[PDB]
Symmetry: D5
Subunit: 195 residues, 10 copies
C-alpha cells in the first residue's frame, strides 16, 4: 500500500470520525473545499512533542483563519482517546479544550494514503500537508519523531502559496509577505535579479 | 521506480558528477559521513526560485559549517550547464561563484531514488533532505515549484536534530536554541508540562 | 492476513510493549510457558464494556494465580493510552491501578494473528483465548462488541482443561470441580453413563 | 477451504438432512429466521462429552424456547448413525429420544464453512454459534475435545444479546438479566461508572 | 484430488484406526504384504446393503483364509460408530461379532485415494479391490449404491489371480478352479481351442 | 488425459466404427438409449482370454436381450482386424460368426475416456461397464490381463440394477432374482433382518 | 507430441516387439548399426495397398541384402495381428510367410516420433525412411493412403546415398548406378556441365 | 516456427515473387486450384544437383501439363539471382531458358511453412510436394542434399493419385498406368489378391 | 523502452518545447509534413562538437530551405538552458542567434523513441535522421560522441532522396546532382552499366 | 531478435563464408583486430545501387589500406551467388574481379545482430558500420534502398575517429584532415571558439 500523496495532484481523499468541540463528528477532506487546509499527522495522544504541536497551532488558529485557512490534526488513536486527551489538563501533557478537529485513523488507511504510516511502530511520523482551496496538494513536510514542526514556517508557506496563486509571480528563498517576488520569464526575471 | 527515501532509515546512496569550485568532481553521499548533510534538489538551472535558494544557502554557508553541517544542491541539468550557470552574473539570474557543490543528475537516477522526480516535466520539484552524521534521513521537505524554501527553518531543524541527538530530550513545536525541551517519559514529561502552565 | 489461531496447535507467537505496574515492559507469549494463560483482546481504551471486563478479571486475579494461571489483556491502543486509562479513576470509566498487563497492538499484527481484528473498525472484537502451560491453544471465545465476557465461565474452563490434562477423564457439559467425569473409552464410559441413570 | 463464519455478518448458510422427531427431514439455516438459534457442532456420535452436551441442551430446551430461541446440533456423522444413537439408552451412552434436531454433515461442507473441522481427525471440535433472529452471527465459542460446554453460559449469552438488541445499552462483564447495563456514550457512560464506584 | 488406484501397480498405501475384535487397532496396508487382500469400501454403518455384504464376507471368511487371503472392510464412519454397530444385534441391522476388521476413513483420504468417495454424498460407493501378496492391485469392482456385491464372484477372482500367478497360464471367461486354462502362446493356445 | 467414467453419472459418450454382422457400421453410445448396455473392452484381437469372453457373451447373448440389455465389445484393433478375427474359425482362436458388435478404438480416445487404456501396453485392460437405459453408468468391473470376466456375474448385476430401478428396494450381497430384498428405511429394514 | 525425424540427424531411436521368422522378438533401431536400413510404416494389417508393399519389399529382399541394406516394416497393429496376417494366404489378402520383420507400435510412440501418425484415423500413413549405416536419417518419403510406394525408387535412393557416402561426388536428378555424377565445387562442377551440354 | 505441411490437409498457403518467362510476377498457391501441382524446393542457385533437377523437370514439363499438372520450383535465393541463373548457359551450370516458375523465398517463410528450411545452413533441403487440384497435400518427398530426385517417380505418383481420385480403386506397390488395382473393401479386394495368386 | 525509428516506416511522432527565435514554442513532428525534415540530436548544451554542428547547419540553412527542407535540433537540455546557450557569444562556445529550432527532451521520451538515448550518460549520442515530406524515415546517421557530422553529406543525401522520389531511378554510390542514375530493372539497368564501362 | 549493434560497445561478433580472391574462406570479425574496419551490408547481388557501392569502395581500397583500414561487404546472398556475381562483367551489373571480401549471411543471423535485416523483404537495407581497431563500434550509417552511400564521407569518418583516438581532441562539423579540432574542456575549448 503506497503513498497516494503527490505534490500538484489532488490530495488523497479522506473521511473519518473526529472530535470537534468535544463531540464526535464525521469529517471529510472535501468539507474543506474553497479554503486552504493545513492537514497534519502526529504520532500519538498522551505523548510529548505531539501536544505541543497541536496546542501551538490551536492557540494561533486565527492567523490561519484570517487568511481563509483551516487546520486539521490526525493520529491513529481512536476518538475516545482523543476526547480523553482533550479532557486532560495541559499541565499534565493533555490538550485541554481545543479549537482544531482531531481526526481518528484507527484503520491506518488515511495514514497509508498519505504515506506517513510507520509499519514498525503502528503509528504515524510527523507529517504535515498543505492543501490549497482547489484541493491540490502543494507542500509536504515530514519530520522524524523527536523534532516538532513550526507554525511560523507553516504560515509563511500558506502565505506564499496564496500569493503565487493570486499574482502568478514566484517566491524566492525565505519569502515573507512584503518581500520581492520574481516574474517567471527568461526576460521578466531580470527585474528581480538586476537590482 | 519507487522512492527509497524513508525517514529513520539510511538516506538512499547516490554518487555523481558535481561542479565544486568551478571544477568537475566525483561526489558521493558517503563523503559526508561524520557530518549532518543538507541535500536538496531544485528544478532547473537558469530559472527563477532556484538560483535564490542556492544563493540563500550559499551566502549563509558558515552557519551550517560551524554546526558540522554541509550543503549539497542537485538538479537534472548537466555539469556543463551548471558551470555555465555559475559563470553567469547574479544580476542576470546566474549564481556567481558558490561554495556549494552542484550535483548533476542527468540520468535521473538520484531524483527517482529520492522520490522528487517529476515524470511529466523531466525535472524535480523542490525537495530538501536532512541527513545526519550517521547517514540516517531525518527530515523531508517537499515544495511545489512556485514556492522557495527557508534557510532559517532548515537551520532550526538541523539544530533541533543535533540537540535531540546529544540530549535525548525531544523538541517542542517551534523549538529554537535556548527553548524548553521535553523528557520523553510519562512522569519525566511533567517537568516540561507543569512548568509551562 | 489470515488467522493463525488453531485449537490444539501452538498459540500464535506474540510480543510487544505492555504496561506492567505502571511501566512499559516488553512482553512475550513465551514468558508464560509453564503456566496457563488467559489471553484476551478488548476493542478500545476509554470505552464501555471494556473497562468492566478488564476490572472483572483484575479484581479476581488471585483466583487465577492460585491455579497457576495468568491473565493478559490486549487492545490496538498505544502503551501511552493504556497508562492514561490506568491513571483514570474508575468513576470516570478508567481502570484505576491494575495487576493485569495491558499489551499494546498498534500495528495490528497480534490481533490479525489471532483472527480478532475488525478490518473496517480498526480495532478488535471481544476475543479470549485459553492457552495451556505447553503453549497450546485450548479454547477460543469470541463475542460481538456489545456483550461482555464471564470470569466464571473462564475459570470453569481453565479448571476443566487443567483437570483433563492431569487425569485423562473428560469433562461433561457443565462440569465444575467436584462433578462427575467420563473415562473416554467405549467400556469405561459406562461407569459414568450407568451411574446417572 | 476457509472459514466463512464471521461475527456481525450473516452466518454461513447451511442445509442438510437432520434427524427430527425420529425422522429424516431436510433442515436449513433459513428455517430459523425470526428466532435466535444456538447452532452447535460436536465431534462424534457414540463418544463421551458429546452425548452429555446434547442431552444437557435437550433436557433444558424450554429455557431456550421460552426466549424465542431454538437449538440445533451437528456432527460429521450420518443421519443413520444419529438415529441409531437416539435409539441407544442413555445408560449405554446413547441419547435416548431427543427434541433437538441432529444435523448431519457427511461432506464436511458445513463444518468447514463454520471453521470447526479438524483436518487431522476427520471430525469437528466443540464449536458453538449464537445466531440472531436476523441471521447475524453474534458469538463463537470453541472448545478443544476434552472439555464440554455450558448450557448456562449459553443462556446468559443469548439473554444478553437479546437485551442489547432491544435496548441498545451494552452488557458488562458477567451481566445476568437484572444486572446494570451501560449507555454506550462518553457522556451517558458515567451514569454507570459513578453508580458502581 | 484424484484416484491412485491403478491395476498392475502397487495399491495405494493406507493406514487408519480399525476395530479388531471389539478393539481399536492401527491397521496398515503393509501389514498385509505376503497375503492376498480383499479390501472393500461400503457406504454407511447402520444402513441396508452394507451389513449384508459385511456379514456375507465374515461368515465365509474361512474360504478366504484357507487360500491365504485376508479381508478388510472400510467406511467413512468413526471407529466408535463401527464398534456400536458391532454391538448391535444382527436382527436389528447390526453385525454382531465380526472377524473382519472395520477400518475407519473419517478424513476421506483413503476413499479419495481409492477413487471411491462420492463428493455429493460424503461417503463411498460399493468399491472392492483385490490386492495380491506383492501389494499389486489386480482387480477393481465398483457398484452403485443399491446393488450388493457377491462373495462367490470375489472368491472366483482371487482363485483366478492366484492360479495365473503360479502356473503362468491364463483363465478364460467363467473360470472356476478345475476349469481349462490357456497357454498364452500363438501356438500353445491351440490345445485349448481345438478341444472345443 | 483422464477417465470420465463415473458411477451414477452419464456414461461418457462414444462413437466409432464397428463390425456388425460382417459389416462396417457407425455405432454410437446414444444408439442404446432405452436399453441397458453391457459395454466392455478387451485387450487384443487374436489373443487368448479375449475370444473366450467375447464368445461366452455372444453364445448367451439371448439371456441379455430377453431382459432388454444389449452387449458391445471394444478393443484398440482396427475394424479390418476385427472382421478378419470373425472370419477365423473358433478352433484357431477366432470368433466365427458373432452377434455382438465389435467396436474399434484405434485412436484410444474411447479407452482413455473409460479409463481402461494401458499407457505402457498400447491396449486396454479387461474393463466392463453396465449402463442403464437412461444412459447412466451403474457398474464398473476391471480385471488385470490374465483373468477373464464372468457372464453369470454380469447377468446378476444387470438383473439387480433393473430390480432396484423398478421396485425401489435394494439388493443384499449375493442377490439373484427371487432373493429377499430390503426396504431402505430405518424401520422397513426390519422385515428383512428379523427374518434371519 | 512432435515429430523427431530430421534429415541429416540421427534417426529417432525405436524399440519394440516384432514378428520375425514367425516369432515375437524385441527389435531395436540400433540393431541395424553398420547397415543401411529401409524403415517403413504402413497403415493397417488386413487392408489393401499395405500387403502389396510388404510383399513387394519382401519378395525382393536380396536386392537390398546384397547392398548391405535391411528392411523393417511397422504398423500400429499388435504383434498377434501381425502373425495372424502372416498366417493368412496371399490369395485372401494375407502376407503368407515373410522374411522382413514386422514391428508393432501399439502405443503410437514410434509413429509419433517419426511424424507419420494420423491423429484422426488412429494409424499411420505410408511413410518410408532411409537410414544410413551410421544411423543418420537421409530420405523421407510420405504417401497419402491410396497410393503405394515403389521398391525401385527406394533401391535407386539407397544406391545413390551409398555412392555419395563413398565418393563424395553428388548425384543428379534421375541418377542410376553408372550415371554421371558431379564434383560439388564451383570449379570441378564444369567437368559435368561441359560434358552434358 | 513449425511445419504446417500435412498429408490429407490443405497445403500451406504461399505467395511471393517468381521469375516467369524472364519477368518478375507475383505467384500464389491458389493460382493452381483446379490443377495438380508439383511444388518443389531446391537448396541453392548456382550449385550442383539443383540445376539438374530444375532442368530435368523443365525439359519434361509437357509430360506434366498433358495430365493437368503444373510444376513450380522454389529456393531461398532472390528473384534477381534466379534470373541471373536463367541467363547463365547450361554449360556453366546455369539453367538457360526455362518454363518452370522459379519462386523466391528470401524471408524463409515458405520453406519454414513446408518444414524444409535448414536452420543452420540458411537454405532448404530437397523437398518436393504433390498437391492435388483441390489444394490438398498428397505426397511429401524429402531428400538429403547430395541426392537428386526423380521425374519418373514423380510422374508415377501424380498418375497414381489422379487415378485413385477418379476411380476409388487403390494403387498397389509399384503401380504404373496399366497395372492391377485393388478395390478397397474386405470382399472386393479378393478380386485383386486371388488374381495374382 | 525500445527504438521506434525504422527506415521506410513513419518516423516516430514527437512533440515538445523548443526555442524558436528566442521564444518557447510547442513544436510537433507533424508540423513538417509537406517538407523533408533533417531532425538531429546532439549530446549536451555548452559542450564542444555540438555547437559546431548546430552552427554548421544554421549558417547553411538556405541550402536546405531552397530544397523544401527544414532542420530541427534536439537535446535532453531544458528550453531554459537552450535559451541561455543561444544568448551566449559564439566566441565563448555559445551559439549566438540561430534560425534552427532547439527542441528540449527533458523527459528523454523523444531520445528513447529515436534509439539515441545513452542510459549510462543521461544524454544522446550524435543521431541524425532524414525524414521525407510524407513523414517517412529515410536515413539514419549515428555518430560516437567525439566526431561531428557533415552538412555536405546531409545535403547530398536529401538531394539523393528527392531525386529518386521524383524520378524512380536509383542513386549510385557517391551520387551528386548531375550524376548518372540507374533504372532499377534487370534490362533497364544496362543503360547505366554499359555506359560507364 | 533485436539489434546488438550499439555505438561505443564491442561490435557484435560475426563469422561466415566469404568469397575472397575468387575462393571460399571462413571469415571472422576478430580477424580484423588491430585494424579499423568498414563493415557494410548491401541488399542483393545482381541488383542496382549495390554493385556501385561495392565497386566504389573496391576501386578506392588503398585510401583505406594506407590508413590501416579494411573493408568488408555482406549480403544475405549465398557464396555461390557472390562468386557468380564476381564472374559477371561490370558492363552488365556484375562486379568483375574485386579486392574486398564478400561475406554471405544466408541465415540472416549477422544482419539481425546488426539490426539491418528487413523482415518483410528477406534482405538487408544499406547499412554501414565503422568499427575501430579495438573492435568497438563507432559509427552507424543506414540508408533506405534507393540511395547509395559515400566513400568520401566514410573516409572522412574513419580519419576523424583515428584522429580523436590518437590526440584526444574532438572533430567539429565537417572536419577533414588538417581542419581545426577542439579541446574538450570548459576552459580549453576557448582556443577553438575565440579565434
Amino acid at each position: 500500500h503506497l503513498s497516494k500523496a503527490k505534490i500538484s495532484k489532488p490530495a488523497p481523499y479522506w473521511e473519518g470520525t473526529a472530535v470537534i468541540d468535544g463531540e464526535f463528528k464525521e469529517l471529510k477532506l472535501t468539507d474543506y473545499r474553497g479554503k486552504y487546509l493545513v492537514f497534519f499527522f502526529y504520532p500519538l495522544d498522551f505523548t510529548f512533542v505531539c501536544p505541543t504541536e497541536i496546542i501551538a497551532f490551536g492557540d494561533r488558529l486565527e492567523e490561519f483563519r484570517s487568511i481563509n485557512t483551516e487546520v486539521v490534526a490526525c493520529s491513529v488513536d481512536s476518538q475516545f482517546t482523543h476526547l480523553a486527551w482533550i479532557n486532560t489538563p495541559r499541565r499534565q501533557g493533555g490538550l485541554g479544550p481545543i479549537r482544531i478537529p482531531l481526526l481518528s485513523d484507527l484503520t491506518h488507511q488515511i495514514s497509508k494514503d498519505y504515506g506517513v504510516y510507520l509499519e514498525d511502530s503502528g503509528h504515524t511520523l510527523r507529517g504535515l500537508f498543505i492543501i490549497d482551496d482547489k484541493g491540490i496538494l502543494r507542500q509536504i513536510t515530514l519530520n522524524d519523531l523527536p523534532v516538532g514542526r513550526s507554525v511560523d514556517e507553516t504560515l509563511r508557506l500558506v502565505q506564499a502559496f496564496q500569493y503565487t496563486d493570486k499574482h502568478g509571480e514566484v517566491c524566492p528563498a525565505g519569502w515573507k509577505p512584503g518581500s520581492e517576488t520574481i516574474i517567471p520569464d527568461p526576460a521578466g526575471k531580470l527585474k528581480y535579479f538586476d537590482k
